[PDB]
Symmetry: C2
Subunit: 163 residues, 2 copies
């Protein structure tokens, strides 16, 4: 539950850095939804990294999901990092609509791949965290559809339940 305190800490900093005041363009900010810590391997950013990847390759980053202030159905994905001075900054943005595939790595419990125009391989810090972020990403995606339209989605799901 060190996890939960870290999450709340990150959340506050993130909203403060990036989803709270007009930016400076002087455009309003997006509304924050959720985030997750990830590890990115700069030499293997699109596929499973060799077991022997130099610790120097491993970057600490964050994925963040948010929505347009005037559009609750226009969601964005961001990649961000925490700088040494504690500030936060976003380095990449995608529209959710660019997402075409989400897959868990069968061999690495924290590994997953997001596919937009290219593939993005990332790892979470734990198996549980992978489950949570992916659930968040996919349910949010589903919620952006306008009413009943399941013809366009495909999944390997066989069990769904409430705890």
């Amino acid at each position: 539950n060190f996890l939960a305190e870290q999450y709340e800490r990150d959340r506050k900093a993130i909203i403060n850095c990036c989803f709270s005041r007009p930016d400076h363009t002087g455009e309003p900010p997006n509304n924050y939804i959720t985030h997750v810590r990830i590890i990115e391997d700069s030499k293997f950013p699109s596929s499973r990294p060799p077991p022997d990847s130099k610790l120097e390759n491993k970057k600490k980053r964050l994925l963040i999901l948010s929505a347009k202030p005037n559009n609750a159905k226009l969601i964005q994905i961001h990649k961000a990092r925490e700088n040494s001075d504690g500030s936060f900054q976003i380095g990449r943005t995608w529209q959710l609509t660019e997402l075409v595939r989400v897959e868990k790595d069968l061999e690495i419990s924290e590994g997953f791949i997001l596919t937009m125009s290219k593939k993005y391989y990332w790892e979470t810090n734990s198996a549980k965290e992978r489950t949570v972020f992916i659930k968040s990403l996919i349910t949010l995606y589903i919620q952006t559809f306008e009413g009943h339209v399941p013809e366009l989605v495909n999944w390997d799901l066989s069990l769904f339940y409430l705890d």
Copy 2:
């Protein structure tokens, strides 16, 4: 394939006519349905592959929404009468649904849990895929904003075509 789609439009129209067009209060709005087989000797678990034809009853599952709130969903069980009319025999609130499980060995079978368990089969594997997709996506959509920690699943892959 083409037969199915045509059967599906036929059923849909009849279902709306019989159950979602007249009023006590305004009728619900139809969303979707599927044809199911129910085993009356084995209603809550996988029937023996041996189960006699006389146990097998033709039904339908229908999803609908309250006219005022598209996020208040109901599940209905119905049956087509010999005369060609349809009638609803059972209703649940979608909020009652606590589990959805595909039968891992019978590709047409699935189980829904509300207070009791209900085992049903569709007529094909593809029809199961389609209805379950509708059921779960709708459940998800009845949530405003981020969906809570409580929902769980075994998904490991998701993609658009």
